[PDB]
Amino acid sequence: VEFVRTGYGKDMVKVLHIQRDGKYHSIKEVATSVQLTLSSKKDYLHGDNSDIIPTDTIKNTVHVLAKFKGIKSIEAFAMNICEHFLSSFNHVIRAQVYVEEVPWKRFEKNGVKHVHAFIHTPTGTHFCEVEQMKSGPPVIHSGIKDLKVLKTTQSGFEGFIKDQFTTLPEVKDRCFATQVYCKWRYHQGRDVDFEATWDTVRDIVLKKFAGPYDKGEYSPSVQKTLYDIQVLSLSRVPEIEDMEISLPNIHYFNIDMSKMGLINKEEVLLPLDNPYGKITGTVKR
Amino acid sequence: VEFVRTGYGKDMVKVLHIQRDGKYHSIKEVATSVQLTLSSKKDYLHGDNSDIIPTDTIKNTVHVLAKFKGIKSIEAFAMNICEHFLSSFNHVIRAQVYVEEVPWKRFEKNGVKHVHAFIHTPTGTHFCEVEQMKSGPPVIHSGIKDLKVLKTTQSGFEGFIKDQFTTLPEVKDRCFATQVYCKWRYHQGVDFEATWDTVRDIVLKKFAGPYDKGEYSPSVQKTLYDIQVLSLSRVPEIEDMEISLPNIHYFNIDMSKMGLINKEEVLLPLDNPYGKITGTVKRKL
Amino acid sequence: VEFVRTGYGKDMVKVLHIQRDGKYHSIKEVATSVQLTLSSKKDYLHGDNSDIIPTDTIKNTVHVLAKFKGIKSIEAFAMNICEHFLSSFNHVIRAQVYVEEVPWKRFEKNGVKHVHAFIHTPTGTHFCEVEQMKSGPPVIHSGIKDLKVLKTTQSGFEGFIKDQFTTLPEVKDRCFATQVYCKWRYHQGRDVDFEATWDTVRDIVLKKFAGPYDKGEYSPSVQKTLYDIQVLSLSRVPEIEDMEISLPNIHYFNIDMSKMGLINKEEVLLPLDNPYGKITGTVKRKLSSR
Amino acid sequence: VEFVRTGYGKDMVKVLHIQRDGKYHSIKEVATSVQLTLSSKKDYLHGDNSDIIPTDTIKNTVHVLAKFKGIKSIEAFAMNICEHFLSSFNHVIRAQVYVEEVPWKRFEKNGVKHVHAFIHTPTGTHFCEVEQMKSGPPVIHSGIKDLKVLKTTQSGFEGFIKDQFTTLPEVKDRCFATQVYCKWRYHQGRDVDFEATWDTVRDIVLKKFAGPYDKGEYSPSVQKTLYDIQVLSLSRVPEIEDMEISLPNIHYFNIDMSKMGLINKEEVLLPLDNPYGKITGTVKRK
């Protein structure tokens, strides 16, 4: 028969960490998933749980570690969780932690931030994935997800192959809408702020996508826009070792009103839930 | 078998309206539902479709009206849709239109707005409902939904009835998290977009209080009534207001059995169950 | 200002009730929502919680009631919950409970039901709503939801109005797909087997939709199919006083392949998530049967 | 900076195929995703779309192939899609197709099936994944998802490590509820009835989970139940080369009512949406 992979853990452990400096409260809410691989496989083979750390104990441990070490950075948290299970149990040979941060934002009005009120603001969501082998260092990925953006021009698609199944007319203008998924690996020898990096890749992604605020910038391809973001990210940020990106192309099609004796192109568009294009790529150094 | 109520229509008609003033593009993406009641019931009784406006035709009409009359306000849009079907068809005795606007926001960095880039920003979602009888005026409700907010203090709950099933301790400090649903009917005398922003601001005012210190809330019922009161006064054309405040729980994780003293730095976000506090007040005053 | 409506409660209280008769286990998992109206309004006006039953207590109470009276009918359950809050607290003037039952089904293979294994089977979901005023009786609604069905013919749509915005071709054959929502009120005087009723309305609904096996039955309108179900239900089931129905018309459109020099009609269809038609109606008992 | 992997395609291409054999109609509704990798990267590097098959064209192709070729086997459909793009375009070096079938079931009462009525019945959902390199064979996975089951006994959990963070009491009886995800690769040189193989793996899954219908075989470990399914399946089906399983452990906790003066043990339980346990494993064959 033979084994290829094993893993058990707890998913969707949710936590809100609160810090109080007088009237000024700070929060971090996360959802966490933890998987462990054991050296023994007798749990699978015979039903012997004597090496099993109960998933309930994994959940408690995430809660405790958040209390003892706080969160501060989601990457730090996951490293601490990994570090904890590799140190405390010698038959634990691999740990993996995924963390997603709820996009809470401090209330803001007329330039002043509220001391203890927050509004849920999913304008890009920070997540991370840390994996660590027994007696090896941790590999850290950070990422953006759930960032939804739409520009009404400076996008075109032309010069493509036209086979017997191609009805797509070429265009110099179209809507470009997407939901960014962007995941990058870090090198090593750390020295990364993590939170500052994340803000930076996000700043870039939104730059390559929308360009200068007065003129904007034409993109001839979703593929190009993707690759540009990647190159500019590995440039402005040395500690990143690779980047995976996935861009849906969410369609807003011109509604043909010919059959009604009307001319639209292109003021009324149909937003389609599906299907959608999906352009992906991963580059490294 | 006496008929009580009838209605047919099209749901989830999605439209993106794009207006182009030079390089400066403006959008409104909505999802629309339209219901009509007919005077004859022969379609129900016998299968006689001779009075039916096909729902497909209703969809086409939403698309067309979006082209010709634009999308100034979703309230305007829905009135247009209502008026069209009552005026154009003598056997249509009732029209009802629901519209929800996708929370797109123009890109911004340091106060400068992008000419054609938008980011999906669900920090309160504008919807509206218009109903109109044949030869009567249209009744307009407008509303807020999907506004999710959390404050980590200035909230308490005490002085309640303690029966034999009450294990809830009284508290002077707690998290308050909610998802606002707020729906108001208008009188007859209105800037819809301005009214909406205003009620929203009152809502966020009563929930979080002054940005320096906050404001104690002793009761979600109380916070609800204040918003209703501050709103009908500050906005005369509002005739009544319905509010629904979930109380989404963040419970302190008791770590006693593990030898830790938490209270109250690490909390558990619960998806369910949750409290639901609701109320409708009408004028006057 | 003046008050029009108030209500507070706990939503999404979930419970699994397990009964064990030897090796033979039977379950019911529900999700419950409870709202109460108080006589006092001092909670809203001044922040005075002295008349408030904590929502946590409402939640605890639902758990306890499921333990004490069990839950053999979700309608029964909801009635018990209502009566509990009206009896135990005199300043509670209205109670409303919504209950939805998880469509668990006993494992079945080659004709035998398993003693304690269940498979989640959303082929129609039982829900109910009970409302009760202080010193009045309870009104009981039961319902079907989340029942999704598709027939590939015996449906047509023609003879409709064609204005300047009508591009819809008339048709004698089309796919009909829907997700049934069906909610009925009961009369009174009791004598109702809530669970027995529910299976039959579902039986009816599914009958009026697909007709006789082997041949099927033509539907000329979603509106017609809707009314028939209503009439046939108020007939076969005397204790029902009204019925509300909502039938989405979920579109499967022929994919036109002309532009590629191909002829489809009608073997490849496009399932649309939206938009969709929505045909609704409520009939009440006074006249008619059959 | 250099490329590691690229791919582009269309997702969520939905199709309903209707075949009419007289009065007897048969359907298969699927949702399909297709990804292609190209040899040139000038689309990425420079904005040169001259090698791109438009994703709209990919969509059209799925529709057409569904029309000329059939569906029936979801695996067949995905291989066809793969075959088409590797054949028709030599600059396409990889094709990957994911297909999920909507769980429609013919109306039924005691074995009498309706000729054209179907009810949506998610009691196990068939999916498949086919991947293929240029001038290599297709690699085929099939799988089960969204199969949600609960047994109220014949499950226990004891003999585990109890550290200082362990408050979990050992138990000999408990609810076990899960949502099965099960994905297997096929060998090759396969004379495979995909639909039958799928029904076979599914009932093996349900067998090891619930045991005999009269009694109900005890499971001392979800890890154990997982391995049994993997083992019984590679045996009953030679053409399977490996199997991946993921079993959530969805919690139903006894509601402690002591603080209210009640003894509940254990007729009323709390269904928790999260967190949940997740037990996974992949075995291959020799």
Coordinates of C-alpha atoms in Angstrom, one line a residue, chain A residues 16 23 33 56 107 113 150 153 187 189 212 250 267 270 275:
Chain A
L16 CA -10.0 38.1 18.6
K23 CA -8.9 54.6 26.1
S33 CA -5.9 26.4 10.6
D56 CA -9.2 20.1 20.8
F107 CA -13.3 54.1 12.3
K113 CA -9.1 57.7 14.1
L150 CA -12.9 47.5 -11.6
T153 CA -11.1 51.7 -19.5
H187 CA 13.8 34.2 1.3
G189 CA 17.8 35.4 7.1
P212 CA -1.5 57.2 -12.6
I250 CA -14.7 39.1 -14.3
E267 CA -23.2 52.5 -21.3
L270 CA -24.1 43.0 -17.9
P275 CA -18.0 32.0 -16.3

